[PDB]
Write a protein that binds this ligand. Structure first.
Ligand SMILES: CN(CCC(=O)O)c1ncnc2[nH]ccc12
Length: 167
């Protein structure tokens, strides 16, 4: 048993809810929250800017030190950093950004990072402002992630569309 509440069960291991991932993280304090990162860990908008703002910019300070030491992530890659006041850990995962021209086949590689963690609170990757079809992103998630994933879908109307269209 875990602390996640009000999720619809899609599969053996994937759950979904209409929720702000920031508010969900603050309430649950999960072991792992996933950030929808870019390779530079520049947290400007969407999940990254919202998560970073909720940490009072501590996520960005930590991320800048990580990049100064290690250089950029790969598209499809990840790193584990602090969860600050939101979670024990933040798994920063880089899905492909369609609005920058990246290979959508890299979305599966991105979701494979989740399999290194038993339980995660996460957003849909590569959708929203990254520009991918969220219905596709949910299908890749279900077909790739084997660990227990709790998906927070910010957009109300999209949540309803994802549930109604789920196969
Ligand atoms: C943007 N995005 C993913 C798109 C969606 O889920 O519709 C988010 N996902 C979950 N929580 C969030 N808080 C702020 C944004 C945000």
């Amino acid at each position: 048993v875990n602390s996640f509440s009000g999720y619809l069960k899609l599969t053996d291991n994937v759950y979904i809810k209409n929720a702000d991932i920031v508010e969900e993280a603050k309430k649950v304090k999960p072991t792992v929250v996933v950030n929808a990162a870019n390779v530079y860990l520049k947290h400007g908008g969407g999940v990254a800017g919202a998560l970073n703002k909720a940490t009072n910019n501590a996520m960005q300070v930590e991320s800048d030190d990580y990049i100064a030491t290690n250089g950029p992530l790969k598209v499809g890659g990840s790193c584990v950093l602090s969860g600050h006041n939101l979670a024990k850990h933040c798994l920063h995962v880089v899905g492909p950004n369609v609005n920058k021209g990246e290979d959508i086949q890299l979305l599966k590689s991105a979701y494979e990072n989740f399999n290194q963690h038993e339980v995660l609170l996460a957003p849909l990757l590569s959708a929203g402002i990254f520009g991918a079809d969220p219905i596709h992103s949910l299908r890749v998630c279900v077909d790739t992630v084997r660990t227990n994933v709790y998906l927070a879908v910010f957009d109300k109307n999209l949540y309803d569309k994802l549930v109604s269209s789920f196969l």
